[PDB]
Ligand binder design. Structure first.
Ligand SMILES: *P(=O)(O)OCC(C)(C)[C@@H](O)C(=O)NCCC(=O)NCCSC(C)=O
Ligand SMILES: *P(=O)(O)OCC(C)(C)[C@@H](O)C(=O)NCCC(=O)NCCSC(C)=O
Lengths: 82, 82
C-alpha cells in the first residue's frame, strides 16, 4: 500500500474502503469474504487516510446489519461512507 | 407496557422505539440519557412488535456513531428506523 502515492504523498486507495466494507459484511454474515457477492452503491469518500512507512494506522468499519449502511470511520472523522 | 393495547392486540408503543433509540445514543456517548438532548427524524415504524404478556421480548437497537442512523430490530426483522 506504500506503492500508491499521489504527488509524493502516500494516500489510502479509494478502493480500499470497498474491500474493507466487503470484509466486514462477510464477518457480519459469518462467511469468508471471498465467497460473498456484494454490491456497494453510492460510495463516498470524505477524507483520505495518510499512510506512513514503518507505521501502523487503524480504522474502524461499521456495517449496519439489515439495511446495509457502512462506515469506515477513523476515530470521529469519516473517511468513507456508502 | 401491557396497559396499552389496540382491540386486544398488545403492541409496543410507537414512541417506545423513540426511547430505546434515545437511551442507546446516550449509552454510546457515555452520558446519562436524561442529560442528552436528542432529535429523531423520519422515524418509520416498519412493522409491529407484539409484546408477549408474562414473558420477555428482546430488541437490538443499533446507532451509527457519526451519521446517527438508528435501527430497532428483532432477529432479522426490522421494527423501526430513522
Ligand atoms: P477540499 O476540496 O474540500 O478536499 C476534499 C477532499 C479532501 C479532496 C475529499 O473530497 C477527497 O476526495 N479526498 C480524497 C479521496 C481519496 O481517498 N482519494 C485517493 C484514492 S484515489 C487515487 C487515484 O488517488
Ligand atoms: P401491511 O400493509 O404490510 O401492514 C403494515 C403494518 C403491519 C400495519 C405495519 O406498518 C404496522 O404494524 N405498523 C404499526 C406500528 C404501530 O403499532 N405503531 C403504533 C403503536 S400501537 C398504538 C397506536 O396503539
Amino acid at each position: 500500500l506504500l506503492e500508491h502515492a499521489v504527488d509524493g504523498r502516500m494516500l489510502f486507495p479509494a478502493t480500499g474502503t470497498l474491500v474493507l466494507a466487503w470484509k466486514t459484511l462477510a464477518k457480519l454474515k459469518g462467511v469468508e469474504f471471498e465467497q460473498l457477492g456484494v454490491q456497494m452503491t453510492n460510495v463516498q469518500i470524505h477524507q483520505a487516510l495518510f499512510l506512513n512507512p514503518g507505521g501502523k494506522t487503524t480504522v474502524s468499519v461499521s456495517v449496519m446489519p439489515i439495511t446495509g449502511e457502512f462506515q469506515v470511520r477513523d476515530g470521529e472523522s469519516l473517511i468513507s461512507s456508502g
